[PDB]
Structure formats: C-alpha cells, structure tokens
A paper describes a structure:
Here, a highly sample-efficient methodology to measure serial crystallography data from microcrystals by raster scanning within standard in situ 96-well crystallization plates is described. We demonstrate that raster-scan serial data collection within crystallization plates can be an easily accessible and rapid method of assessing microcrystallization experiments and determining suitable-quality room-temperature structures.
DtpAa crystallized in the monoclinic space group P21, representing a much lower symmetry than was the case for HEWL (P43212) and making it an important test system for the general applicability of this method. However, the increase in completeness from eight to 12 drops was about 2%, while it increased by only 0.02% on increasing from 12 to 35 drops. Using these statistics as an example, it is clear to see that while adding four additional drops to the initial eight-drop data set led to a large increase in data quality (with an additional 20 min of data collection), the addition of 23 extra drops only led to a marginal increase in comparison, but led to a significantly longer data-collection time (nearly two additional hours of data collection). More amino acids, water molecules and alternate conformations could be convincingly modelled when 35 drops were merged (22 854 merged diffraction patterns), although these were removed for the 12-drop and eight-drop data sets (10 054 and 5360 merged diffraction patterns, respectively) where the electron density was not as clear. Despite the difference in merging statistics, the maps for all three were of similar quality, in particular noting the well defined waters around the heme in chain A in each case. The electron density corresponding to the Fe—OH2 bond is also marginally clearer in the maps from 12 and 35 wells (10 054 and 22 854 merged diffraction patterns, respectively), but this would not hinder map interpretation from the eight-drop data set (5360 merged diffraction patterns) within a screening context.
Numbering used by the authors:
A (entry chain B): 56 to 223, 225 to 417
B (entry chain A): 55 to 417
Amino acid sequence: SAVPFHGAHQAGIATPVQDRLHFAAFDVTTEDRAAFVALLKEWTAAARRLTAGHAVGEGAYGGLPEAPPDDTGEALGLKPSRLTLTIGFGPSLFTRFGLADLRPEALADLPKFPGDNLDRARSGGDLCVQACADDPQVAVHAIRNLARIGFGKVVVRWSQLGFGKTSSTPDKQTPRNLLGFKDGTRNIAGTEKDRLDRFVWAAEKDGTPWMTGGSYLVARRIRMHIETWDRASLQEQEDVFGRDKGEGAPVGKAKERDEPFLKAMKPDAHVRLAHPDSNGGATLLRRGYSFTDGTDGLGRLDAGLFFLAYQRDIRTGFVPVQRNLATDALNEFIQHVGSAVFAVPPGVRDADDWWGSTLFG
Amino acid sequence: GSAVPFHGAHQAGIATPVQDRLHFAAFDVTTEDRAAFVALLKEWTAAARRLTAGHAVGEGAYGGLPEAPPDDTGEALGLKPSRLTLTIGFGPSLFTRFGLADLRPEALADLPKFPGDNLDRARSGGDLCVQACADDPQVAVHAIRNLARIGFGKVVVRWSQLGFGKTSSTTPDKQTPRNLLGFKDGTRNIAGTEKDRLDRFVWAAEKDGTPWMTGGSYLVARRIRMHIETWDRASLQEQEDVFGRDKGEGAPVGKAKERDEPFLKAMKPDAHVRLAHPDSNGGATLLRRGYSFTDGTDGLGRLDAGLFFLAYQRDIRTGFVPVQRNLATDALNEFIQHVGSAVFAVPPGVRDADDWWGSTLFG
Ligand code: HEM
Ligand code: HEM
C-alpha cells in the first residue's frame, strides 16, 4: 500500500495514521537562499521516489563502482508501507533568507506552560520532516537519506522514533497509549472534510496566502512517569482521565464512543479540561505516537507520548487547550521535555511542484 | 499474530523465527535472599506464560478492586500475542550471589578485551537479562515493563536496548533483512530447522561439563555503533569489498545468487565474510540474532545508528571469541565500534506448567 504524494494538502496529516514514526528536526547551516531552494527541490524529488517505494537518485547499486550509491540501500526489498513525508518550517527559519515578514502570525511562539522541563537539545529546529510508515526501517531510511542529501546544507538537530498500533490489530480499534488507556477516541478524523477546513487547514483569509492549504504543527515530547503511574489504583487512573480503562467509556456511560457527560467527571480530569466545550470550541487533530527510547540512569522506563497536533492556528488550537491543562490531574504523571512548532506548507500539486514553492517562489 | 509455544526443552526466542521488534533488558539483583529470588523466578515464569499467550498478567488489567493498582499495566489489551518470546539469561556476576559460585559454567567465559573496544560500563554487564522479541513493539515493551514491575524490590533494570528492526534470520526460506549499512544480514546463519547444527553449535550438552545448563545456550550481546557518515561517503566497490558480497543481491563476489556458497579466495583477505566464515575459524559457527537500533542523534548533527549484535552458541570460548579475534583485521572495523558488551548463560527451557525459569540451577 502507498499514499499519493501529490495533492492540495501534504500527505501524513489527514491521511490514515501509519504504524511507525520517524520525526526529525533539521537546522539549516547555509545562508544561501538559492542553495536552500535547490535542496528543497532535491528533497521533493527524493520524497517522490521514497513514497513510491523506489530508491533515491540512480539507485542503491548498479552504478559506477568508484562512486558512492545515491541510496543507502537499507530499504531494498521492502514495500512503500504507506510512507508519507511531511515537511514543516520552524519559526527560526524565517530569520534566514529574508523571510522575516513572511512568517505567519498563526505560527506563534508557545508560552511557557506550568511544569515545562524542556530540553533545548530536543526542542526547536529550522525545519522538520515527519516520516510515517508501517515499516520503521522504511521511515528511518527516508530520514537517513534526506539527511545525507542535505549534508552541508542541513544537520539533524533531534530525531524521535515512535510507534502506534501494528495494523497487521483490527483497525477502527482505538490504539492504547503506554498508560493503558484508549487514545484517539474523540479526535478529528481524516474523513471529516468540513472539520478539517474549520480546524486544521489554513485558509487564504487567515492572513498568510503562501500557507493556504497547509497547517500548523505542535510537537511535544511528553515523558510519562511509568513507575509512578503503575503504582496508582485503577480508580485513580480512571479518575485522572474521566474514562474507564477497560472500555474507554466516559464515566457514567457504557460504550467508548458514547459522548461524554463532562459534569460527571472530576473537575480536573484530562478529558473534561481538554474537551472543546471547555475551551471555547477549540478542536485539535491529534496524530501523536508512543515512544520508548530505553531506560534512564535510575532504571526508569524512558517512555511517553510524542504528542503531535495539527491545527489551523496555534493561538486558537494547542495554546488554549494546553493552557486549560494547567490543573490537569494527569500532570502528576507526565512532564513535557521537548517542544517545537512548525508551519506545514501546502501540498506538492504535481510533478513539477516542490516543497515550499509557495513560500520561496 | 499467532503465539509461539512457551514450553519446551529449549527456551523460545533462539531458534524461533526472528520477530520484527526487540526489547532487550539487563537486570541487576538487589536482594540477597535466595528464597525471595527463587519466588521471583516462579512469579516471572507465570507472567511469561500469560504474556506469550496474549493474556494479561495476574488478575488482569482492570475489573479488580477499584482501590488497588491493576496487576497488568494494560497497554497490551486487545493485541495479539504477536509471536512474543521471552528468553531469560544469567550473567556471570549473578553467580557471586546465593551460593552459586561453584555452579558457574566454564563456557560462560568473560570476554577478553578486543582492539577498538570502547565499552560503556553502564550499558554493559548485568546479573540477568530478558530478551523480549515480538512483531509488535508495544507487546514487547509491555512484557518488559510488567516483568520489571513484578520484580520491584528484588531486581532493577541496569540497561535496556530496543531494536526497531531485525538484522538476522533463522528462516532461510524467508527474505533476508538488511542492516543499516544496506547489506543483507543473516544469509549464512543457523536455521531453526537445522536440528543437527543447533545441537552441534548452539545447545549445551551434558558432556560439556555443566549439567544444569543442558538444553540451554550462551548469549553474547554486543552494542555496535556504526559510523554511517564514514560509510555513506564510501564507494559502492569499497562497501562490497568490505563484506565480500555485492550489495544488491547479496551474492558472494563473482557469484549470482545470495545463497550461492562463498568462494573465500575471491574476496579480499580482510573481507568480513572471509574472516568470519567458519572455514576461517576452525569450523566455529554462530547463531546470529541481532537487531538494528537508532537512539536519536549523536549531538553532532547526525543520526545515531547501530546494530545490537546477539550471538547464541554452545560455548562462548569456541564461538564468538575465536570469530571476534579473527575480525581484528576486519575491513568493517573502519566503520563500526563496539560500545556495549554482555554475556549470559541462557538456562534450558521451561519443560511444562510446573517448571520455572532457572529451576535446574536453583532446584
Ligand atoms: C502523555 C500525554 C497525554 C496522554 C496520555 C493523553 C491521553 C488522553 C486520553 C486517554 C484521552 C481520552 C481518549 C481520547 O479521546 O483520545 C485524551 C483526550 C484528549 N486529549 Fe489527551 N493526553 C495527553 C496529552 C494531551 C495534550 C498535551 C493535549 C493538548 C494540549 C491533549 C488533548 C486532548 C484532547 C483535545 C482530547 C479530546 C477530548 C475530547 O474531545 O473528549 N492531550 N487524551
Ligand atoms: C555492525 C556489525 C556487523 C555487520 C554490519 C555485519 C554484517 C554482515 C554481513 C552483511 C554478512 C553477510 C551476510 C550473512 O551471511 O549474514 C555477515 C556475515 C557474518 N557475520 Fe557479520 N556483521 C557485523 C558484525 C559481526 C560480528 C561482531 C560477528 C562475530 C563476532 C559477525 C559474524 C558473522 C558471521 C559468522 C557471518 C557468516 C559468515 C559466513 O558463514 O559466510 N558479524 N555479517
């Protein structure tokens, strides 16, 4: 299975969620606008090959023996695996190439939120590439080759491996986060065209014409205190979210997809504070992935949720909802340790178009 | 999605078909009570029976007393067994405890220092290890997480390593996976169907000198970083010369098919396959079962990439050690570096429902 690379929007936002994630933030090391635009065109050409299951350039072998292969070859024999490659532009990129007056107002800096413990090395970035696929080696291969093609012009600032469900699990079945709770029940679906136009896609009336058809991405590396969470009682765990753990139904209800009655939950339950009704209607497209990088020095599981949210405007999406989570009962068990925002440009229209063409011209 | 039988004369997860994901965890023992540690092995064995069958540990992930923490952490609820295997091993440092000194197998030999070693002592060693292999990473993480939670107060996680993809094959009938250098890895390994080769090279026999290890094996774990910047700027001929096989097909140099037998005299004298081939090491043969890993960036603008090398053998002294010694002149050494190491004695399998991990040692 493959996902079409071209379209009015970039794939990997409203398209079906893939099993694995390789998210990489890049810093730009060149000041030459012409050299960066040339890289964007080379990256788009490589992305077309990668999302179709082909090697980049002239291939991974069969070329001149004296030359290094254009493709590093670790994806040979694998399927496209629904690979999507989604590029975004960080705020720091607009301080380069004379783009200062073209930074959208919707690409706002995030305020400091209570409990933030952000790692500067795992935060920020001039640009990002979100690589989603059902095979993690397909996603890693894409990031590794894009970084190789960009060497000398970009460096990898930080990268994150993520996983969700293993589709080979019934789909429709809501996946569970590493806390044991169903995650994604009340979310914007890719089938909800109208809700995508209202809450996800940027329109030309929003004030930034080059972003029309694109979106804004908020990335948060949220560590979970697994060992602390696992010592809490089942009632404490269900009280934290407002949904039961077995079925995922809201409190007082029977089925997972029963619409919640917020007054029945505790006032600081996560769902009650994150619900659009508690936030002036602010609705988010959550497309995050669980992560487990290993164990820290104290033997604790370095695991959590790599939270990804797409929205029409950061000021009316993540910011008001995250601000409402200031008293979240979940805050006892999580800690945001990394953060980045990106303007995700519109999609590549056809074979002659390229990443970021509406911005650089 | 199916389950792998947990019981047997041997532990599963060695000759078993190699699953997609790996969660390897090394534990240190914090208790001096032998009876308490034996009770943990039985409690771990009961949990493994549930985990490998796709069932939650204990009384379940929910439905119990509201005021009590669930026995199962619950993040594997609604998932298939996903070919989950749990393989336990005992490190040499364990035998300094519980009066097990005289029971250390001679085949559980300390590895000598090899040229180029830069071993991080934090991510090395360990009293014991649990190799969790499954096609679903959430299933693998859930097993390690619940085993450690059951072991709270008696064991602590020393270090862990997650493998996002396999770089090995025990099933030559299936496509050989590729490592992060782009080459097929696992072409000439030991297959799970080759019973005679497994008895000769992998499983410990009673005549080897350690009766309680009969039916088990010996594991060598090596964390190997790859210099992918150095590798990616090397020419295709250089890359193929390093291994002795072409990159596209994986055939030995000069030959057409991956599984054609290597003609060692045609490769360079420092080629990896020529130096590691059993014919170059007095017949020494290994069961490789490693995985790729990438733990983010190196802080220098590059993806961190490596291979978590896992080797099972009948005797460390006659398996990994002579082969690794012969790789002293390996052309691959220019592109890799061993940064973590550990050896473990993998006990025999859990015979039936009454048996438990390590019962031949304790029991
Ligand atoms: C480790 C971090 C987090 C965990 C484990 C978590 C977990 C959950 C769970 C279990 C639900 C209920 C099931 C569902 O509808 O998805 C939920 C709902 C939701 N969460 Fe979170 N969450 C986390 C962080 C966040 C953050 C940082 C935000 C926004 C800033 C957020 C926004 C939402 C929203 C909007 C909903 C939908 C609520 C509704 O409309 O009913 N979550 N989350
Ligand atoms: C990053 C580290 C390594 C890489 C990338 C690597 C790669 C490869 C490749 C491409 C092959 C040829 C295909 C195959 O037969 O599997 C191979 C074969 C082999 N390797 Fe390695 N290897 C690594 C480390 C090691 C180590 C540390 C050992 C032993 C100490 C080892 C022992 C072997 C053996 C025994 C064979 C089979 C040779 C034969 O019988 O023809 N490898 N390896």
